[PDB]
Amino acid sequence: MSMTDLLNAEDIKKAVGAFSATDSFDHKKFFQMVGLKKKSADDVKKVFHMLDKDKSGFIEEDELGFILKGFSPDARDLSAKETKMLMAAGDKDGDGKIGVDEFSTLVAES
Ligand SMILES: [Ca+2]
Ligand SMILES: [Ca+2]
C-alpha cells in the first residue's frame, strides 16, 4: 500500500531503527514510535497486508525473517533468536502465525 502515506515516513524512520539490531525486538516500542496504535484499525489492516509478502493473510517464519522489508528499505534479516521469539510472542492465538487483530493489540498488551 504505502508505509509512508498511511502511517508517516518520519514515524517509519524511527520504527525501522527500533528493530535495527540482531535479537533486540521491541514490538510495543516500534508500534508506538511508528504511531501504529495511533492510526485506525482499518489502517492496521493495510499495515499487516504489507508484511504479508505472499498475500496468504498470515505471517510465518519465511516472511518473519525480514518482515521489516514491508515497513521500509534497510530492514535486513532478523536473528534466528529474534525470529523464534517473534513467532511465539506475535502469535497471541496458537496458530504459530501473526494475524492483524492480534498484531494490533500485541503492543497495547506490550
Ligand atoms: Ca504469508
Ligand atoms: Ca493467530
Side-chain angles (χ1 to χ4, degrees):
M1 238 56 245
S2 283
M3 221 108 302
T4 278
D5 182 76
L6 296 192
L7 298 198
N8 275 356
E10 291 180 71
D11 294 67
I12 264 86
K13 153 71 187 185
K14 278 163 161 153
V16 179
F19 292 177
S20 195
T22 52
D23 334 81
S24 209
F25 207 79
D26 210 342
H27 46 73
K28 357 72 192 302
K29 222 184 202 175
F30 182 106
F31 266 67
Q32 285 164 84
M33 284 180 158
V34 83
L36 261 168
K37 286 197 295 186
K38 114 197 173 192
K39 316 319 294 278
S40 185
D42 211 78
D43 215 46
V44 136
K45 248 186 203 182
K46 286 84 171 200
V47 173
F48 180 71
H49 225 241
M50 202 67 199
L51 285 62
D52 190 65
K53 300 284 296 198
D54 66 23
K55 293 291 108 67
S56 85
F58 303 98
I59 308 160
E60 51 259 303
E61 61 177 85
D62 187 61
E63 290 171 314
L64 208 115
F66 59 89
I67 176 284
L68 282 168
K69 256 234 178 184
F71 287 115
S72 266
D74 199 33
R76 321 200 168 214
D77 49 310
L78 310 191
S79 173
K81 316 300 193 189
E82 216 172 66
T83 286
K84 197 170 189 169
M85 233 177 191
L86 172 53
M87 189 173 80
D91 175 48
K92 278 271 161 181
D93 216 15
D95 309 300
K97 286 115 75 175
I98 293 178
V100 57
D101 199 66
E102 305 128 83
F103 201 50
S104 188
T105 54
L106 208 298
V107 290
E109 291 240 280
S110 75

